[PDB]
Amino acid sequence: RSKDLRHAFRSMFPSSE
Numbered sequence: 001r002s003k004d005l006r007h008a009f010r011s012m013f014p015s016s017e
Contacts (some may be wrong), residue, residue, distance in 0.1 A: 010016055
């Protein structure tokens, strides 16, 4: 979905690591 992908943007962020 489009709203489910929004959470994927954080994976790219340094907070995910």
